[PDB]
Amino acid sequence: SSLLDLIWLETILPKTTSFIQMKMSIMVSNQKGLIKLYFLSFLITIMISMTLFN
Amino acid sequence: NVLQIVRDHWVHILVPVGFVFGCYLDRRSDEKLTAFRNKSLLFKRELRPNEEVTWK
Amino acid sequence: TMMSGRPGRVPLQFLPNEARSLPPPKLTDPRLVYMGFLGYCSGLIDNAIRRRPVVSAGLHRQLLYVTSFVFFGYYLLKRQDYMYALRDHDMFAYVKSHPEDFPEKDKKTYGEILEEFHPVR
Amino acid sequence: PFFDVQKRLGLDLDRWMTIQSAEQPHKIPGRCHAFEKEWIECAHGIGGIRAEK
Amino acid sequence: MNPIIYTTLIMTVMSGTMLVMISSHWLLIWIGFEMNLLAMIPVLMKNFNPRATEAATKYFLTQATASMMLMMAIIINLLYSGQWTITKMFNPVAMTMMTMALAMKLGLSPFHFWVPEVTQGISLQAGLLLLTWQKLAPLSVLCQISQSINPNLMLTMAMLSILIGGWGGLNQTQLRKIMAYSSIAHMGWMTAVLPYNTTMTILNLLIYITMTLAMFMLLIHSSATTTLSLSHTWNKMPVITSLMMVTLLSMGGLPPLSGFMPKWMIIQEMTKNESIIMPTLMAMTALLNLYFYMRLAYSSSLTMFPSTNNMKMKWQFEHTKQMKLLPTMIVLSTLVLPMTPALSSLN
Amino acid sequence: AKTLLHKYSDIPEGTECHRKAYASTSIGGATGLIVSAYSIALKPPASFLEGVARTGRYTFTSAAIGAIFGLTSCISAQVREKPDDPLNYFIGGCAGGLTLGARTRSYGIGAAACAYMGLTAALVKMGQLEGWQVFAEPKV
Amino acid sequence: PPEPTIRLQEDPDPEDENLYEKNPDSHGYDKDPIVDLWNMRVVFFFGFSIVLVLGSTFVAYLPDYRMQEWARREAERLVKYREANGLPLMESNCFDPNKIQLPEDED
């Protein structure tokens, strides 16, 4: 009841998914609104696209 | 009282009318799957003197 | 199947002339009935959003919704049928003109084909 | 996407400015008029894939 | 602004898009994009406040950069083949520059950063126009030159867009940012099928536009831009919240709703090309969009939140302006799954 | 680009363990450098020297993970005398995952890394064997 | 602390109502006695009288479309023929071997 059903079977599928998605969301959405960083990322991805797909 | 309970008990008639309509629609959909009527190897039969189709 | 460049295609023509060679959809087509039902639901939701008696507020408005949905649905069904007819026409013509790519396979019966048997145990 | 209004109406809104071998003012030829003319005549109606190959 | 001026600006936006979609010359397509950009700014800045001005500035910067890259690709393609007609790209470098420019115009990842910013800055009507009408021209250009695109780059950006939309929408309490991230994810779904079938791209665009129109009109009707503000809507107009909940169910791709039609078809199309892994990841990632749609549905109609005393006054008044096309949009975005084969109309 | 892909794939699976380890280390270092560039572009942590320290840490961690994966998988393939089995890539993949856990110093992250990297490595091996295409070319 | 210790203006949770108080003979269907009685009557008539009895009788007398009696008669006549003619009852091969073309191995 407690060890497997309430803890580990809960930890494996649903809790891990929730934790992973929460961290990924917090990483992706947390941008300070500084377009300097946005366009620096734009330059990096432009050069990566030029050097990676041809 | 007629023409008063009709306005109050009219809803009851809908389930039975739906059933009759569904039966008619089932027959209508059946009518378009007659490509093999009296043509199967198992029940290939000679028509009766006053029979047109083996089933409907 | 990209038919955008198919030869002899008038640019902005909804229904070509050759589409008139096809049987029109019947007025009691189930898809037309569903389009009318969609118009009826739109009328009900229109009554509900405007805070009016949902079933019996505006009969002219609901009739107009049903009629417009049926009209557009009829023409849409015609165009749909025409496009599927073109697809089948092109496919059959291509198979006819390329016999070496669609060969006639040999007829084999199951009494002379060996299939592996897998017991369920 | 592309709505060929010009083809439907026969207008020529911008087709006059697409290729070198198409009716320049004062009959001035492009530097590669002959090559472009040959390539266009080769690939007409054949389609993109077959023209490419 | 003057209603005549507003009408003129809207018609100029529409004429720029139509010039993009009817022309066969790259210069005229560029001119249409320029006209659309030029007439779009005052529409975004219609309600004058510093937020809208900031949003208009960000939008102008991104779109002008995209236009410059588009012209650069046009000139390179002209250099390697003296062609002005929109057809083949004729150069690997010109095709990459062109795909980047159109992705920045659409808001595809990695060029997605401006969409939530601008959508949050502007009002609900400006956001409606921005997220519906402004996708028609870049997507039409992409549909025309799809046989040139490198499938690797387009599929990479589509998968990135789906992932980013899913993860970024999970963290939002503002409704406009939720709409922006939903738009990003739907753009990702649309561009993943361009290399294989442009008809599915157009079908996805039509379904997405219908759902977005219904959603924005519902948000304007119950004038809420925040999750908690939307939580108060049940105490005045519960039918609006119910319609919103069903629309959110449709937007999440749950069958038998209309939003299930594109993804299904797209997945179906991609399996005809022996592509199995990518559609699977796409669906599993769209589960995140469904999750935050469900959170909004919980907050809006499935549970009843506390209200305020002043709401009683609002009970005594009715909307002065009503939306003619909202019921049709709701019904179309909810109940058109039985009419799926009509996609052969090459919509 | 695809140069490192050819470099890694050209080597036979059960031979040249050092060359496989070198190719895997190169791929890991490149991936770590790209991730570091992304992080620096989106988030400037404190300064030039702290940022380059972060980039060095990320690159070294990624290169170590790649090295451990490559060497362990190649050794397993050579010793088991059964090449082209996803179990070897599973073992190597979460040897790499376990090393990631040791670098991060957490038992939970080590176990999760073993799970998820062994599964991913086995899936990649299966896809190579069966010809699964992540980016399918348009045929129809 | 000038707060009332009250988070919001809320209705008190009511006490559950007893149907037997205002109406003995309450049948537990509805608080209106007439609607209550008629709901009892329709449930009992359409659930026990119609479905439970007539449906059970209908299922009991369903015609033999699964062909159990037909199968037993076929087996009876087949056994009668095979016993008389000395044939070895059931055969091991379900299909006639003469209409099967086996592949030669020649190994």
Next chain:
Amino acid sequence: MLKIIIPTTMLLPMTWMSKHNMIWINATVHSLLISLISLSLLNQLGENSLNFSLTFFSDSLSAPLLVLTTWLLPLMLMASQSHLSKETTTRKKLYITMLILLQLFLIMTFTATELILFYILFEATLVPTLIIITRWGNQTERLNAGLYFLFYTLAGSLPLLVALVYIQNTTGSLNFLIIHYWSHPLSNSWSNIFMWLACIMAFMVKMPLYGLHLWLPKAHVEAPIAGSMVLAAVLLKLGGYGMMRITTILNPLTNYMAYPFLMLSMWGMIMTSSICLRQTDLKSLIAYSSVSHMALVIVAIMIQTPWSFMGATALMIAHGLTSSMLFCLANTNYERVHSRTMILARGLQTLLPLMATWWLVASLTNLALPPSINLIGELFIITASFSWSNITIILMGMNMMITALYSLYMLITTQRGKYTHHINNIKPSFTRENALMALHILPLLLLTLNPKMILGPLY
């Protein structure tokens, strides 16, 4: 098949145009009539099937499930009448609309000659149940439960869809008839292994499998009574129906691929039966018992023998009826005590004797007392498992013993002993509740007279 579908659709306009005090009467009457109409699909053939049209067909696996689905709606209306009395007319009509929509989706799901149509309706059922749980549930956990109940399902169902469309690209059809007649062996390959997993996991998560069963106690404990009834009676059987339908194209790979699921089921039935022994909640206990029974059904389907399929059909029908009855009894207790804790209200046999008799009969049928159809299914599955391997008898016997133990424990805790002194609001049981229990239990004891009606197409 439209003679059943159209009246179910007409149930909606009849509900919404009913008087404020006539919704329950009309809905119950017409649902009972629809059940009587559907009862004529039990006339099945020893030949192929009842192929009505290109879209819908009937089978002796489909017909018992259809009859049970139709019969469940009137009982759900009777059970929901009580706790929805203080509710507005519009919201009562919306609840009845959800119930009718769920019935319509289930009826079309069970016939559904196409696998894509089956998938679409199989997932369409997910929406009304979610609304019912998250809207008319009492506790604060209902929302959480709904989330679980949703995502678990979709976690299994999106891969299936992919596999489904993939199959049609290779076979050319997803019609059950063409799929069955044109079936070809599935090679032992990695691609085929993952196709097998995609085909199976969607139905496996809905049974539920022992590893993936966490959503079920949450959803059942949190849902209202009608939601619990339909979840335990019909919605759990969608996985069994789907597995029986789809395992035809998975041979011979099922022989190897079934081992992990067989071990999970045979051990998890013991695990969940033992969990039932230490449970302080009636609804949670009944949910865990359902998990055990569905584990046995999973074993039956994976073994894939004629006796396995017959036992699986019989057990699915019997469990649906029994679990619905058990939930109804627990809900009758809850509507008096408002606690849902087993140890609180005790000695109820002294205060409610006829309801104690209903409790005894429900516990006896959950215990699989012969010649009930519960034991018919149990015994057929056990015999098939014994033929599969003689060592399964150990686990089956342990499961039987533990099942008897917790069934009689639940009976004794609630009905026997001394009444709780401070509980004085226990009223005599209503005619509605007694009739609800009778309408659950008499069909079971009637079905034991004609078992072939619920033994499926391999009878």
Next chain:
Amino acid sequence: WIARTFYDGPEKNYEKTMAILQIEAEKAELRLKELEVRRLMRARGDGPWYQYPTIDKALIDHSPKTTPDN
């Protein structure tokens, strides 16, 4: 009586199944054929489908061009 009033004979269901099976078999073989035809047209480009535009040769000007060599 039940068979006479509620049901029909076996031939009806038998031949309806035969017709349904024919329809589904032809649909399946048509689906396979259409997939193969689409693949062939997309690869070779000689069919009515996947026809991508090329420059219209009616735009070319055929006149003396102020220089003899075009």
